[PDB]
Amino acid sequence: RVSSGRDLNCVPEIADTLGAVAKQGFDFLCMPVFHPRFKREFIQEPAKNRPGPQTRSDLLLSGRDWNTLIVGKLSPWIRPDSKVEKIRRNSEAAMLQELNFGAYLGLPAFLLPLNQEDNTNLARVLTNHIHTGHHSSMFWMRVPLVAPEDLRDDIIENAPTTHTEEYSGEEKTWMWWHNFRTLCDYSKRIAVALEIGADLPSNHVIDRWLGEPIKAAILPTSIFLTNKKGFPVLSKMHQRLIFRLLKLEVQFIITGTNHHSFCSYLQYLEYLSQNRPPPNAYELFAKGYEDYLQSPLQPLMDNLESQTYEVFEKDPIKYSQYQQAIYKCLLDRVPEEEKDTNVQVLMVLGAGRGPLVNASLRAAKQADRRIKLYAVEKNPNAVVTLENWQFEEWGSQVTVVSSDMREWVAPEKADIIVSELLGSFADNELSPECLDGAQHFLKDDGVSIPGEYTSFLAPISSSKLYNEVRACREKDRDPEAQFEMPYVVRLHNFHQLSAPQPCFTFSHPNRDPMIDNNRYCTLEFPVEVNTVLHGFAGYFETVLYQDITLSIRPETHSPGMFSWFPILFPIKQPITVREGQTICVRFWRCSNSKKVWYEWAVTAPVCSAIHNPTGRSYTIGL
Amino acid sequence: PPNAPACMERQLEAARYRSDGALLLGASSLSGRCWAGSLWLFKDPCAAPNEGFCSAGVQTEAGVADLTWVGERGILVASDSGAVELWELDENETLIVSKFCKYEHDDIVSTVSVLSSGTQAVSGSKDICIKVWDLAQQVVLSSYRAHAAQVTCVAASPHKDSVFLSCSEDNRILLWDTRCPKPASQIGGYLPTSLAWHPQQSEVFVFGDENGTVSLVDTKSVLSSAVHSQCVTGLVFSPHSVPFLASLSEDCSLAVLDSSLSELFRSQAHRDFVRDATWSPLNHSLLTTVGWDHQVVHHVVPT
Ligand SMILES: CSC[C@H]1O[C@@H](n2cnc3c(N)ncnc32)[C@H](O)[C@@H]1O
Ligand SMILES: Cc1cc2ncccc2nc1N
Numbered sequence: 001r002v003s004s005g006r007d008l009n010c011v012p013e014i015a016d017t018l019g020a021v022a023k024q025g026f027d028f029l030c031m032p033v034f035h036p037r038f039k040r041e042f043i044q045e046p047a048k049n050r051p052g053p054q055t056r057s058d059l060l061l062s063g064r065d066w067n068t069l070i071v072g073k074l075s076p077w078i079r080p081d082s083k084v085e086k087i088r089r090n091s092e093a094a095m096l097q098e099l100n101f102g103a104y105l106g107l108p109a110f111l112l113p114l115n116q117e118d119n120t121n122l123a124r125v126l127t128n129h130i131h132t133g134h135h136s137s138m139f140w141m142r143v144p145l146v147a148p149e150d151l152r153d154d155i156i157e158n159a160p161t162t163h164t165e166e167y168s169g170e171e172k173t174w175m176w177w178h179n180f181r182t183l184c185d186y187s188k189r190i191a192v193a194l195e196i197g198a199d200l201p202s203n204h205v206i207d208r209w210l211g212e213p214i215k216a217a218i219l220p221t222s223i224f225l226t227n228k229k230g231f232p233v234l235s236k237m238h239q240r241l242i243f244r245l246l247k248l249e250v251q252f253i254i255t256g257t258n259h260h261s262f263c264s265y266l267q268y269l270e271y272l273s274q275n276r277p278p279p280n281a282y283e284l285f286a287k288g289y290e291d292y293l294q295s296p297l298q299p300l301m302d303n304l305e306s307q308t309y310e311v312f313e314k315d316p317i318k319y320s321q322y323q324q325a326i327y328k329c330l331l332d333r334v335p336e337e338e339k340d341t342n343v344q345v346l347m348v349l350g351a352g353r354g355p356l357v358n359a360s361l362r363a364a365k366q367a368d369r370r371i372k373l374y375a376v377e378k379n380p381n382a383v384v385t386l387e388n389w390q391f392e393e394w395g396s397q398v399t400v401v402s403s404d405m406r407e408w409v410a411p412e413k414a415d416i417i418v419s420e421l422l423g424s425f426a427d428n429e430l431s432p433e434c435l436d437g438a439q440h441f442l443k444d445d446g447v448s449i450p451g452e453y454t455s456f457l458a459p460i461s462s463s464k465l466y467n468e469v470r471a472c473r474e475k476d477r478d479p480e481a482q483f484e485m486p487y488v489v490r491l492h493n494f495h496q497l498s499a500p501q502p503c504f505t506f507s508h509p510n511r512d513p514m515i516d517n518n519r520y521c522t523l524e525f526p527v528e529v530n531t532v533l534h535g536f537a538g539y540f541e542t543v544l545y546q547d548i549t550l551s552i553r554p555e556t557h558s559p560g561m562f563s564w565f566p567i568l569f570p571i572k573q574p575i576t577v578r579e580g581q582t583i584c585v586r587f588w589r590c591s592n593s594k595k596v597w598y599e600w601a602v603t604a605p606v607c608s609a610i611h612n613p614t615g616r617s618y619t620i621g622l
Numbered sequence: 623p624p625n626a627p628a629c630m631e632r633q634l635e636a637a638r639y640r641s642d643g644a645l646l647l648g649a650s651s652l653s654g655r656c657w658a659g660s661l662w663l664f665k666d667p668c669a670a671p672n673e674g675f676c677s678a679g680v681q682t683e684a685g686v687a688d689l690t691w692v693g694e695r696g697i698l699v700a701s702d703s704g705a706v707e708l709w710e711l712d713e714n715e716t717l718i719v720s721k722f723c724k725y726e727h728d729d730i731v732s733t734v735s736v737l738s739s740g741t742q743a744v745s746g747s748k749d750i751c752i753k754v755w756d757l758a759q760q761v762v763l764s765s766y767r768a769h770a771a772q773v774t775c776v777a778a779s780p781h782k783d784s785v786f787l788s789c790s791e792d793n794r795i796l797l798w799d800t801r802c803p804k805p806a807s808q809i810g811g812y813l814p815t816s817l818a819w820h821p822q823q824s825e826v827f828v829f830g831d832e833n834g835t836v837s838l839v840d841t842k843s844v845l846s847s848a849v850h851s852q853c854v855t856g857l858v859f860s861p862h863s864v865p866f867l868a869s870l871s872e873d874c875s876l877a878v879l880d881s882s883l884s885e886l887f888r889s890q891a892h893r894d895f896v897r898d899a900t901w902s903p904l905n906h907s908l909l910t911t912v913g914w915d916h917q918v919v920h921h922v923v924p925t
C-alpha cells in the first residue's frame with residue numbers, strides 16, 4: 001500500500017476538500033493554514049492593526065484529523081532572505097506565526113520551500129522555532145532535482161540557456177539542502193520533500209540524494225505522459241526513480257491541477273507498486289532492520305542467548321557449505337584403501353548448539369569415511385543443549401567439552417579443526433587469538449575450516465546513518481563515544497563511494513615462529529562523484545576449504561545468507577569529497593593481554609582525528 | 623438579487639470602469655471559514671461597496687487574485703484554483719453567467735490582461751508559466767516557461783496583439799513579441815512588482831518594485847523616484863491627453879504622479895493595503911481605489 005497525499009494551494013471549504021480528497025483515495029492533504037495571498041504587516045501602521053480573524057478556526061476539524069490528515073504549507077509570500085529589510089522582518093514574524101499555528105494544531109509535517117541559494121535567515125527562524133517548546137513535528141524542505149532556472153524554456157532571446165555540461169552546477173539544489181540542514185545542525189525533524197521535474201537530470205545529480213533523509217517525493221501532474229487509451233503514465237526513466245523511492249518508503253505527494261481530463265494519477269502509482277522487481281530472500285528477512293544500529297555480537301566475552309543461536313542455525317545453505325568443506329577435506333586426507341582403518345579426529349571449536357556437529361556427521365556419511373568428534377564450547381548454557389543432543393542422539397561418537405579452546409588440554413591432537421568464530425568484519429569476534437591458542441593440539445599436517453578469512457572496507461555516504469549514530473549520545477560517557485565504535489546494521493539508505501578493498505587477512509594454521517595478530521593497513525579509494533563521507537562499510541570473505549567459500553561482500557555475496565548484515569565504522573565530522581579526489585583511510589588492529597580493538601583515521605582528502613585510540617570507546621574482550 | 627449572495631467578501635482586490643462608467647468590483651475572503659470570491663457590478667459607483675444597491679452579483683468557487691473587462695460585457699478572472707474564468711452578462715445585465723472555467727495553471731493565477739485585439743488574452747501564475755488564451759475557442763494557444771519564479775504582473779500592449787510585458791520574483795522584466803522564434807526579451811535592482819504601458823507612447827512603460835520605487839523606462843535603452851515606503855502593488859495611467867500615473871502600495875497610501883514622476887496628490891485614506899485603482903471615463907478628474915479595508919474611496923485629483 002503506497003502512502004500518498006494531495007497538494008492544494010486553494011481550499012475554499014476545508015471539510016468539503018478532505019471529503020473529495022478522501023473519495024479520490026489520498027491518505028493526507030498538504031494545504032495552507034493561512035490563506036496564501038493573505039499578506040500580513042507587523043511593524044508599520046495602519047496595516048498591522050488589521051481586525052481578525054487572521055485565519056480559519058481550529059474547531060473546523062477534529063484533533064485526530066489535524067494529527068493525521070493535514071500537512072501545513074508556509075505561505076509563498078514569506079521570504080526571510082529578501083534583500084529588503086521590511087520584507088525580511090515581516091517574513092520572520094509571519095514564519096514564526098505560521099509554524100507556531102502548525103504546532104498549535106499539532107500537524108505531523110510542515111512544508112517549507114528551498115527555491116534559492118541563500119536560505120540562511122530561513123534556517124535561523126526554523127532553528128528558533130525548533131528550540132521553542134517540547135512539541136515534536138516534522139519539517140519537509142520542498143526542493144527540486146533541477147532548479148526552475150536550469151529547466152526553463154529557451155525562449156529569452158538575449159539570455160539563452162547554457163548547452164554546456166556544468167557538473168557541479170547541475171547538482172546546485174543538493175547544495176541548497178546541504179547548507180540548510182548544516183545551518184540547522186542536522187535536526188532529525190528536518191527532512192527532504194524531493195520535487196521531480198518533467199525532464200530528469202543526469203544520474204550523478206539523482207545519485208547525489210542517496211543517503212539523504214527523503215520523507216516525501218512531490219510529483220506534479222504536468223510530468224505525466226499520456227498512453228493510447230488516455231490514462232496518465234510516466235516514462236521508463238521516471239519509473240526507475242519511483243522504484244528507488246518506494247524502497248525508501250517515501251510519501252508520494254501529487255501537486256497541480258488535472259491535465260488528463262483525479263484518482264487516475266494515484267491509481268498509476270498503485271500499478272507501479274504492485275508491478276515492481278520482487279522481494280528477494282535477503283530483503284525479506286532484513287525487513288524491519290533497515291539502517292537500525294546494533295552492537296556487534298561478542299561470543300567470546302559474552303554468553304550468547306538461546307534465540308541468538310537459533311538465528312545463526314536458521315541458515316541451511318551456510319552449513320551445507322561447511323558440510324562440503326569437510327566432505328572434500330576427509331577425501332583428500334583419508335584415501336579409499338584406508339577407509340575402515342583411518343578414523344579422522346574432528347574438533348568443532350565453538351560448537352554452540354551443534355549445527356557444525358550435525359554438518360560434520362552428515363559430511364562423514366556422504367564422504368563414506370569414519371570420524372571422531374569433539375564439541376568444544378565455552379558458553380556453559382549452550383553445553384546443556386549439546387549434552388542433551390549428545391545423550392539422546394549422537395552418543396559416544398561426539399565428546400562434548402565444556403571449556404575454552406585456548407585453556408583446554410586435549411587428550412589427542414586434531415586432524416581437522418572446524419570453527420565458526422567469524423563476525424561481519426571477519427576477525428571482530430577474535431577468531432585469530434582463539435585458534436592461535438587452539439593451534440597447539442592441531443597435528444603437524446592438520447587442516448583448519450575455515451583455513452583463511454579477509455575483511456573488506458568501502459567508504460559510504462549516508463546523512464541518515466550519520467544522524468542515527470549522532471543520536472546514540474549516552475549519559476555517563478564521552479559525548480562523541482558513539483562515533484568511535486562499529487555497528488552491525490542492514491545498510492539501506494546509503495551510497496557506496498568506491499568498490500570495497502581488502503583490509504586485514506588471517507591464515508589457519510599460522511605456522512610462523514613469531515605470531516603477531518596486530519595490523520596496520522593504508523587503503524586508497526578512487527571517488528568519481530561529489531559527495532560527503534560519513535563512514536566505512538565493512539564486509540568479509542572466508543575460505544572454508546579450497547574453493548568452498550562464504551562471503552557477505554555485495555559483489556561476491558554467498559547465496560541465501562540472509563541474517564548476516566554488514567558492519568559500519570562511522571566518523572565524527574563528515575568529510576567533503578569532490579569528483580576525482582581519493583579517500584585515503586587508515587585502519588589498525590590493536591591488542592593487549594585483556595582487549596582487542598580497531599582504530600581508524602581518514603588522511604585524504606582532509607585529515608580526521610584517530611578514532612578509538614587505545615580502545616577508549618570500544619574494545620572486543622579476550 | 624436576483625441569484626446573488628447577501629454579504630460581499632471583506633478583501634476588495636480589483637476595481638475597473640467600462641466605457642459607460644459601470645464599476646466592476648472583484649473580492650476575495652482571505653480569512654474566516656470559507657475562502658471563496660465574488661464578482662459585482664455598480665452602475666451607481668457611489669453606492670459601492672453597499673451590496674443592496676448594486677446592479678449584478680455572483681458567487682465564484684475560489685478567491686479572485688485579479689480580473690479585467692473583455693470589451694463591455696465579458697469579465698476575465700484569475701482564480702486561486704489554477705484556472706482562468708470568463709463570465710458574460712445576460713441580455714438585461716441582471717445576472718453574471720459563467721461562459722467557461724478551464725483549469726490549466728498548476729498554482730494560483732495571480733495576474734491577467736486582455737490583448738489589443740480583444741479575442742485573446744494572457745495570464746500569469748505562481749506555477750512560473752505565462753499562457754496566451756483564445757477567448758472564442760476557450761483554449762491555451764501557447765504555454766511559456768520563461769521565468770524561474772512566481773509571475774507577479776503581466777500587462778498587454780495597448781495597440782499590438784503580439785507584444786506584452788511580464789515581471790517575476792526572478793528579478794526579470796521580459797518584453798514579449800510572439801512573432802519572434804524566441805519571443806521573450808530581458809530588459810537590462812529590487813524585484814519588479816507592477817507594470818503599466820504608456821497609453822500614447824508605444825515604446826515606453828513604467829514598473830514599480832518591492833522597495834516602493836516607480837521607474838520610467840524606454841524599450842530602446844532612465845528616471846525614477848522613491849514614491850512609497852513599501853511594495854508598489856499597481857500602476858494605472860489616467861485617460862487624459864497628458865496622462866497622470868496613479869501608484870498603489872502595501873503602505874496603505876495612494877500617490878498620483880506627473881510625466882516626470884513628481885508627487886502631485888497624496889491620500890492616506892485606506893487603513894489596509896490599496897489593491898486596484900481605476901479612472902472614471904465620464905469625469906477624468908475622479909479616481910476610485912479599493913483595498914482590504916473594504917473601502918471604495920472616490921478621490922478628487924486636482925488637475
Ligand atoms: C556458534 S557461535 C560461536 C561460538 O564460539 C564460542 N566461542 C567463542 N570463543 C571461544 C573460545 N575461546 N573457546 C571456546 N568457544 C568459544 C561461543 O561461545 C559461541 O558458542
Ligand atoms: C557463528 C556466528 C554467526 C554470526 N552471524 C551473524 C553475525 C555474527 C556471527 N558470528 C558468529 N560467530
Ligand SMILES: [Cl-]
Nearest residue numbers: 293294295472
Ligand atoms: Cl546500539
Ligand SMILES: [Cl-]
Nearest residue numbers: 595614615619
Ligand atoms: Cl584497553
